[PDB]
Amino acid sequence: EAPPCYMDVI
Amino acid sequence: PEAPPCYMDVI
Amino acid sequence: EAPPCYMDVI
Amino acid sequence: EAPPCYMDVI
Amino acid sequence: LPLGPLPPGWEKRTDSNGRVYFVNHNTRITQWEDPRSQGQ
Amino acid sequence: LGPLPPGWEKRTDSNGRVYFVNHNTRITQWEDPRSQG
Amino acid sequence: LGPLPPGWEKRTDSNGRVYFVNHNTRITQWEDPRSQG
Amino acid sequence: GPLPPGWEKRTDSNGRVYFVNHNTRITQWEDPRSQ
């Protein structure tokens, strides 16, 4: 649906 | 840092 | 939602 | 040319 | 003969230009052609 | 304490840390908004 | 990631979202086939 | 094209490309250069 949360990105 | 789940993860 | 279907691609 | 993509018409 | 019903899963629709098309909700495709003219 | 202010929801993440959701502004934070209020 | 497998092409939609087109099977998907593979 | 300042292109575990803005912490599927 949406891409990963920022905090999961980093 | 740690943040909570982002709003798009919540819903 | 979904990517463009093939006939729209070409 | 071709009809609407399935995922566009649903 | 008479036409008979669309086969199960098929729906008739019209596009934004007024062109008639046929949707198969089982296989998730669309086509210009009435499946009843294809022996379905 | 009291109820959360209008718009907010409490949840618990998968690690068990409690957090707070503002559905009006679509943000999440660790701080209970009742501590402000 | 190395090259795409044969028949595949990377494209971008009108909103700028990257997708992948299999010209053998005429299938499109969001997922990079090299990440599967 | 270049990404605007702050932006980076990444790929998720499923292999879908997305874009991260490190100023706002926004992640989105859409290329910011198309916007």
Side-chain angles (χ1 to χ4, degrees), chain A residues 2-10, chain B residues 1 3-11, chain C residues 2-10, chain D residues 2-8 10, chain E residues 2-40, chain F residues 2-37, chain G residues 2-26 28-37, chain H residues 1-25 27-35:
Chain A
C5 297
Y6 192 79
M7 296 297 306
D8 288 296
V9 160
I10 65 161
Chain B
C6 71
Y7 192 85
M8 289 309 275
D9 260 27
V10 174
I11 67 169
Chain C
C5 69
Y6 192 79
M7 288 308 288
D8 275 29
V9 172
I10 69 162
Chain D
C5 302
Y6 187 86
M7 295 294 290
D8 302 345
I10 69 177
Chain E
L3 194 52
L6 287 162
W10 285 94
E11 187 188 3
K12 183 170 58 157
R13 292 199 193 192
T14 301
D15 78 9
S16 72
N17 287 19
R19 304 174 284 215
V20 173
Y21 68 101
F22 294 87
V23 176
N24 187 337
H25 298 276
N26 291 313
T27 63
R28 302 201 200 293
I29 60 78
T30 61
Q31 60 185 53
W32 290 129
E33 297 73 26
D34 184 338
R36 297 172 292 194
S37 294
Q38 304 181 325
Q40 302 185 66
Chain F
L4 287 167
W8 287 88
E9 185 184 4
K10 174 174 71 181
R11 285 193 209 203
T12 298
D13 76 14
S14 61
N15 301 311
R17 198 167 171 185
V18 167
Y19 66 99
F20 296 88
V21 178
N22 184 332
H23 294 280
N24 284 309
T25 60
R26 295 183 185 145
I27 68 164
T28 65
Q29 61 183 49
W30 296 128
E31 297 84 15
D32 179 347
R34 298 173 287 198
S35 291
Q36 287 200 340
Chain G
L4 291 163
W8 287 92
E9 185 189 13
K10 188 186 98 203
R11 302 273 316 254
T12 51
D13 76 6
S14 66
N15 302 320
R17 193 171 174 182
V18 172
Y19 68 100
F20 295 89
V21 185
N22 192 337
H23 291 277
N24 292 306
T25 61
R26 305 185 174 215
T28 64
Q29 60 189 51
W30 296 127
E31 298 73 26
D32 187 329
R34 297 168 290 191
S35 298
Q36 306 148 335
Chain H
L3 284 175
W7 289 92
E8 187 190 7
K9 190 175 148 290
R10 292 202 193 211
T11 299
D12 76 11
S13 44
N14 292 323
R16 198 174 169 184
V17 175
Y18 66 99
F19 298 88
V20 184
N21 183 340
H22 290 279
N23 293 305
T24 60
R25 308 187 162 204
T27 61
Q28 60 188 48
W29 303 122
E30 295 76 26
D31 192 322
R33 297 166 293 194
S34 303
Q35 310 184 317

